[PDB]
Amino acid sequence: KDPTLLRIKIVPVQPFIANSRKQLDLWASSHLLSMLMYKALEVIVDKFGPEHVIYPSLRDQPFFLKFYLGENIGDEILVANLPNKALAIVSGKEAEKIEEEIKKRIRDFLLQLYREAVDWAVENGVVKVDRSEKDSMLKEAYLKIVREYFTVSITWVSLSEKEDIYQVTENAGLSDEDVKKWLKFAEKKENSRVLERIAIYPLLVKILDSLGERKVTEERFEKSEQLKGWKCHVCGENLAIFGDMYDHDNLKSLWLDEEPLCPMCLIKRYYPVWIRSKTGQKIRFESVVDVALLYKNWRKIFDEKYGKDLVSKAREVSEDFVKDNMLVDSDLYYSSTWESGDEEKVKEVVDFLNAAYKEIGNPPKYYAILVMDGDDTPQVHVAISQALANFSIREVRSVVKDEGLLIYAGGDDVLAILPVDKALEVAYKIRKEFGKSFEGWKLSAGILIVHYKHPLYDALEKARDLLNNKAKNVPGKDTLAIGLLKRSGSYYISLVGWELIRVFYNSELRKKLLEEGVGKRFIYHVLREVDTWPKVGIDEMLKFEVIRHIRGRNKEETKELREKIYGEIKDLLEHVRGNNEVEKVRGLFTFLKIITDAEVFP
Amino acid sequence: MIEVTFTPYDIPLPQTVAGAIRTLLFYKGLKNCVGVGEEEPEFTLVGIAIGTEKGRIYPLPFNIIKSEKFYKVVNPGRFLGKLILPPKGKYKSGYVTESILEKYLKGELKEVEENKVIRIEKEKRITVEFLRIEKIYAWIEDPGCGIKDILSSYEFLTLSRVAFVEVDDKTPDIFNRELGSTKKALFYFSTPTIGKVGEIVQELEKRLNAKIDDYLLVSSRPTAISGWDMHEKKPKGTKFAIPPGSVLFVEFKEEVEVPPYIKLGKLKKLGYGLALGGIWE
Numbered sequence: 001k002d003p004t005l006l007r008i009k010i011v012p013v014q015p016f017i018a019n020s021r022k023q024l025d026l027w028a029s030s031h032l033l034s035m036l037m038y039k040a041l042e043v044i045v046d047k048f049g050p051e052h053v054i055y056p057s058l059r060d061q062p063f064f065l066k067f068y069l070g071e072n073i074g075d076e077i078l079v080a081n082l083p084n085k086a087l088a089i090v091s092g093k094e095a096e097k098i099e100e101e102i103k104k105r106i107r108d109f110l111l112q113l114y115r116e117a118v119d120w121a122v123e124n125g126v127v128k129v130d131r132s133e134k135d136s137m138l139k140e141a142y143l144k145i146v147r148e149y150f151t152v153s154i155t156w157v158s159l160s161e162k163e164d165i166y167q168v169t170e171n172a173g174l175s176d177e178d179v180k181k182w183l184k185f186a187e188k189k190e191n192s193r194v195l196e197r198i199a200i201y202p203l204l205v206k207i208l209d210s211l212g213e214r215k216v217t218e219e220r221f222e223k224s225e226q227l228k229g230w231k232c233h234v235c236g237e238n239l240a241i242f243g244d245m246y247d248h249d250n251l252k253s254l255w256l257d258e259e260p261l262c263p264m265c266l267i268k269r270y271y272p273v274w275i276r277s278k279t280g281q282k283i284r285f286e287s288v289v290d291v292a293l294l295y296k297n298w299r300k301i302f303d304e305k306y307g308k309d310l311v312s313k314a315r316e317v318s319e320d321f322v323k324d325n326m327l328v329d330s331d332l333y334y335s336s337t338w339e340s341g342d343e344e345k346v347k348e349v350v351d352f353l354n355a356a357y358k359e360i361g362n363p364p365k366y367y368a369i370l371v372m373d374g375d376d377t378p379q380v381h382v383a384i385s386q387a388l389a390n391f392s393i394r395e396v397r398s399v400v401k402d403e404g405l406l407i408y409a410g411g412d413d414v415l416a417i418l419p420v421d422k423a424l425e426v427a428y429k430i431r432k433e434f435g436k437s438f439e440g441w442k443l444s445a446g447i448l449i450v451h452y453k454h455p456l457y458d459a460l461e462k463a464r465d466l467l468n469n470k471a472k473n474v475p476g477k478d479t480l481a482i483g484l485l486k487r488s489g490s491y492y493i494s495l496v497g498w499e500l501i502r503v504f505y506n507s508e509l510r511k512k513l514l515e516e517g518v519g520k521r522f523i524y525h526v527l528r529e530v531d532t533w534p535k536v537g538i539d540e541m542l543k544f545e546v547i548r549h550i551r552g553r554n555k556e557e558t559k560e561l562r563e564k565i566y567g568e569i570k571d572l573l574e575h576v577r578g579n580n581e582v583e584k585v586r587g588l589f590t591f592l593k594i595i596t597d598a599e600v601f602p
Numbered sequence: 603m604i605e606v607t608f609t610p611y612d613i614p615l616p617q618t619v620a621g622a623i624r625t626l627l628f629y630k631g632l633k634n635c636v637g638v639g640e641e642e643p644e645f646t647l648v649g650i651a652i653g654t655e656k657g658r659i660y661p662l663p664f665n666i667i668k669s670e671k672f673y674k675v676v677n678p679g680r681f682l683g684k685l686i687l688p689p690k691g692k693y694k695s696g697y698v699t700e701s702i703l704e705k706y707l708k709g710e711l712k713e714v715e716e717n718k719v720i721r722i723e724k725e726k727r728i729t730v731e732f733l734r735i736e737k738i739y740a741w742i743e744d745p746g747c748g749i750k751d752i753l754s755s756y757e758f759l760t761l762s763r764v765a766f767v768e769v770d771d772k773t774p775d776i777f778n779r780e781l782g783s784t785k786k787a788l789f790y791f792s793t794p795t796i797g798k799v800g801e802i803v804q805e806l807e808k809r810l811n812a813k814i815d816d817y818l819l820v821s822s823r824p825t826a827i828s829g830w831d832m833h834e835k836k837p838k839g840t841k842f843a844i845p846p847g848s849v850l851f852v853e854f855k856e857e858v859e860v861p862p863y864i865k866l867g868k869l870k871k872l873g874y875g876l877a878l879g880g881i882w883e
């Protein structure tokens with residue numbers, strides 16, 4: 001009818017996602033957020049179809065195919081592909097009512113999962129509470145928290161309305177060097193300054209965004225007071241259910257694993273079963289240890305020479321540690337777990353694993369968190385939405401495969417948990433595909449390598465930091481910030497260009513290190529030569545250290561080797577971020593220090 | 603107004619300061635202000651600020667975005683009658699010195715150099731994380747509890763860590779500024795301010811007895827405010843505050859004389875709601 005541009009924004013995102021103890025909560029949060037966008041986009045598709053939703057492109061969106069068209073689709077449904085922002089065109093007369101419908105649908109949807117969640121929690125002993133006092137679980141205090149947690153912000157603008165090109169953009173504060181010219185070329189294409197807004201669509205989107213941000217900070221601070229009482233063990237913010245009726249000890253004795261959950265985190269624990277009973281699907285790897293154990297198929301090699309025995313000696317300790325001839329807790333593959341979480345029947349399990357470690361190698365204890373983000377008419381905008389929709393649904397999914405857990409892929413952004421020996425390769429390919437998708441378009445990323453016991457909220461925060469304050473802070477961006485957070489607390493960071501990965505993989509330096517404590521002292525001496533500017537100069541120092549630690553089998557072979565390692569180092573130096581040569585040498589060697597760490601890459 | 607400077611050595615920081623003083627009066631008999639079994643004390647903690655070797659520092663205002671080697675100050679734009687903030691990049695956090703904050707409040711700051719933005723050094727401990735802070739400043743309005751004379755008899759107080767105490771009886775320059783009159787004023791929240799945007803604004807109106815045609819809140823994500831409830835033996839109910847660094851842009855109907863500072867929201871007595879006056883063009 002009367003053309004109107006409408007933007008949708010859902011928050012909070014990262015704070016919600018970060019509030020997770022298990023990888024399953026992380027996935028659930030991400031997935032649920034995507035479901036919220038879906039519940040919001042359906043309100044517009046019901047009234048105008050997928051042709052009026054410019055971004056994201058619903059066309060091939062699994063959620064759209066399975067929940068809207070009802071088709072039967074596979075595990076690809078488990079990946080969150082809908083971002084938290086969207087653009088559509090609606091009847092200007094419909095706008096205001098649509099803003100009310102969308103808020104109500106999301107609000108009703110959550111209250112529903114909550115009610116389903118509470119029944120599930122009781123019927124499955126997540127919370128051991130009287131049949132009677134189960135009703136207090138749906139009192140107002142808890143409904144408030146569920147109802148007010150997310151903030152769906154919708155703002156729109158009339159496309160038909162006419163305004164003075166320059167006067168509108170200047171007043172919105174968009175008069176850049178670019179915008180100034182762009183507009184001109186638009187006044188050239190038409191003998192006029194007073195046009196219909198849809199004539200400056202691009203700049204319209206940005207104004208709409210600003211309008212959107214104004215809307216969110218007015219809506220997100222309206223939260224209601226909360227009853228005094230013990231807080232949720234997962235997020236620490238909201239009241240834990242029953243947290244106002246019991247003392248701290250009595251409260252925790254009422255929950256599975258003694259961890260009191262608030263309404264949101266309860267929905268969080270319940271979301272996986274919901275999605276499973278509604279699609280018959282569930283994530284292949286439930287914990288970070290499952291992903292960690294993919295390193296060099298360690299897990300698969302263990303289940304083919306010690307699987308049966310381990311499960312057997314497990315029951316001997318307790319029938320609980322098993323379920324379907326499998327281990328209940330994936331972390332039971334580690335010695336330490338048994339010496340912590342019939343004393344004598346355990347000494348066996350430990351020693352069994354200890355020996356096994358000597359035959360196939362110690363079990364991987366580190367995993368990787370990969371986060372990626374794009375660096376930096378309407379119908380053409382739609383074409384873009386589709387290239388991105390297709391890149392995130394098919395290409396990203398394509399390169400990850402089953403070597404890790406792809407949690408989110410909403411276009412030019414990615415979140416994934418991967419074993420350490422697949423992180424660099426996966427990240428690189430994703431970036432490569434992204435480039436091909438546009439025959440340019442740069443992508444930045446953060447990879448954090450962390451121990452399986454590290455609190456998930458903190459790891460997620462460091463991964464974001466690596467992305468936003470390291471990688472994206474590099475001039476020209478298009479950088480990968482690699483961070484290694486060791487259990488001892490030591491944290492090594494390195495900023496590199498995407499090509500360093502390729503150059504390093506096919507290098508002699510790489511082979512030479514994977515077969516040397518020679519490489520360790522080479523890395524130490526060089527780093528020690530770059531704490532400050534080396535008097536003899538970067539180049540000469542590198543040759544000196546190369547001659548010092550590199551050797552072949554005979555005078556001629558070692559001559560060739562030193563010459564190649566040095567050359568590869570200079571090449572690699574081409575792809576390390578830094579304000580000068582000493583910073584680059586440091587960065588490259590910190591990177592090397594990271595990939596040659598024996599504990600992380602056993 | 604008295605200014606107390608705490609030098610630490612091995613609930614939010616504001617309440618910690620507030621409570622540290624309440625406990626001191628308690629054991630020192632002067633319970634006439636401790637406010638036994640009450641949320642707020644008798645005296646009012648106007649606010650708290652932190653410091654390093656460089657002196658007092660403040661959270662970088664949320665409308666100052668990093669853009670290459672500079673932190674550009676972004677002022678309000680306008681669209682169809684609404685005050686808006688033009689899109690110009692993500693907000694990167696950090697702190698700023700009082701000197702810099704003053705230029706910003708006067709509207710004289712266009713951009714701040716990269717090496718001028720401070721990043722507070724963290725410190726892990728066993729797990730817990732703390733900020734390598736050197737000084738904590740506290741401004742208190744004592745209706746007659748004789749807090750100044752009591753503190754001046756102590757060099758050390760408990761914040762369970764300990765801190766050296768210094769009590770200067772003189773309001774800081776930041777609170778004595780002369781901003782002038784204008785219709786385009788701003789309010790920088792130096793401490794978490796508890797309340798609904800709309801409520802804060804009303805209060806702001808009925809306080810400067812003026813009318814507000816439009817306002818824009820540049821903030822980030824709510825600060826969750828906890829606290830212990832002694833008589834209840836439980837944790838206080840969570841409240842969500844507008845985080846320090848947030849800027850309330852205001853456009854008055856008729857010119858107003860911008861106060862150098864003003865308190866808003868709940869828990870004023872505990873240090874919350876300290877807003878500093880500013881101006882924009």
Ligand SMILES: Nc1ncnc2c1ncn2[C@@H]1O[C@H](CO)[C@@H](OP(=O)(O)O)[C@H]1O
Pocket residue numbers: 013014017029030031033034080082083084085373408410413415
């Ligand atoms: N459902 C989700 N799950 C994981 N990440 C998501 C997500 N939805 C959006 N994102 C990502 O969260 C970033 C910070 O808010 C967003 O970037 P924007 O700044 O919103 O573009 C998304 O990349």
Ligand SMILES: [Zn+2]
Pocket residue numbers: 232233234235236237238261262263264265266
């Ligand atoms: Zn929670």
